[PDB]
A = this chain, B = another copy of it.
Amino acid sequence: SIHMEDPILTGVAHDRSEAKVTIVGLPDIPGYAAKVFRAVADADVNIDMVLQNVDGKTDITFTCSRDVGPAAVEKLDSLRNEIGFSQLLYDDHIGKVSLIGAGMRSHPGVTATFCEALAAVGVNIELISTSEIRISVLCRDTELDKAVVALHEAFGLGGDEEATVYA
């Protein structure tokens, strides 16, 4: 489409078949995080919403599609000695809702308006990731439909044959 000084919003996406994985109690020593990502690449699972958070320990979280969810954690567990973790967390009752677009990163107001919209329909955010081209949140599947609606409303979308330049 239009593929400027204001952000372009091309749509609202949603995926109901999502899994959330947390590796708990990772040594904060160089090498260990890399093993986590190598294991996932070796197992051929495309991951998203990835983050690291803090003992001398750290946790890593990501999502992936449910269908490969169990394959992910198995691979991960098969390397419990080499990766130093104490626990693997798993949540397959969540879905991802997203604002797609471009140039979103210089306008933090978009993210705030994104969240204000979900809050207004009492949607709870479990994870959030943002980029130039996507703002995604992870929530329970029971709330995906009201989230999509709220987003469409808040941003004047749409078709989605519509795109918008939002101010």
Which residues of A does B touch, CB under 8 Å? 28, 30-31, 33-34, 37-38, 40-41, 45-48, 50-53, 59, 61, 105-109, 111-112, 115-116, 118-119, 122-134
Contact = CB atoms under 8 A, between A and B. Distances in A.
29 contacts: A30-B119, A30-B122, A30-B124, A33-B119, A33-B125, A38-B109, A38-B116, A40-B108, A41-B108, A41-B109, A45-B108, A46-B105, A46-B106, A47-B108, A47-B111, A48-B130, A50-B130, A51-B51, A51-B53, A51-B127, A52-B125, A52-B127, A52-B128, A53-B53, A129-B131, A131-B131, A131-B132, A131-B134, A132-B133
Give the copy number: 2
Given A37-B108, A37-B112, A133-B133, 18 more contacts: A30-B119, A30-B122, A31-B119, A33-B115, A37-B111, A37-B115, A38-B109, A38-B116, A41-B107, A41-B111, A46-B105, A47-B111, A50-B130, A52-B127, A52-B128, A53-B61, A129-B131, A131-B132
A53 B127 CA distance: 7
